[PDB]
Amino acid sequence: MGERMRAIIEDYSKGFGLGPHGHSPTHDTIHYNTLNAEGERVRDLGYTDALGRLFSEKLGDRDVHQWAVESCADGEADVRQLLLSLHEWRERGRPPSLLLANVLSKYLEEEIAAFNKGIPENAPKLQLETSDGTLAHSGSGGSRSGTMWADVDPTTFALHQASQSTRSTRCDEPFILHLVKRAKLGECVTNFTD
């Protein structure tokens, strides 16, 4: 039972196509991910925008929805649109739509100014300008948002940034009780599967 289990799994989970070294994952003499060398390379880098944390810094505690009703006066833009685009940008990390980029530009201008004020001439700055049609942040040099990546698959991004404890998902409860459980039970409360 176990063997054909393994066979099915190894056959379905195998990769294909060409890797960064220009060869198949199954190629004879040359190998990829030696001793989880890529795993560690993700460990120390992590997937996050600079723009992401500037925003999550300036917004601070206060309600996302409140902020959205604020940053749109009545005639500005549909709230649903920039709400959607904001959600898809923060978790499920994506390139921000030029809607969200325009809003964030006229919102965060002083934090981006302060992040940009010291930099030497030949080094990468941080800029939101959509003058070019496309949003893919492999297209801007990664200088549009603060991104170091061309692409990150949504699920992994969401897992990674949620491993940072900033947002409240299981913290919906009463506040202080949530924090007391976090302190006294630790994070090791889920060691137990019961």
């Binding site: 505690d61 206060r62 009463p174 506040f175 202080i176 009780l177």
Partner: peptide, 11 residues
């Protein structure tokens, strides 16, 4: 104390 048990915390 009821508050300290029921309060949410952003405002």
């Amino acid at each position: 104390v009821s508050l300290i048990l029921s309060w949410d915390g952003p405002g």
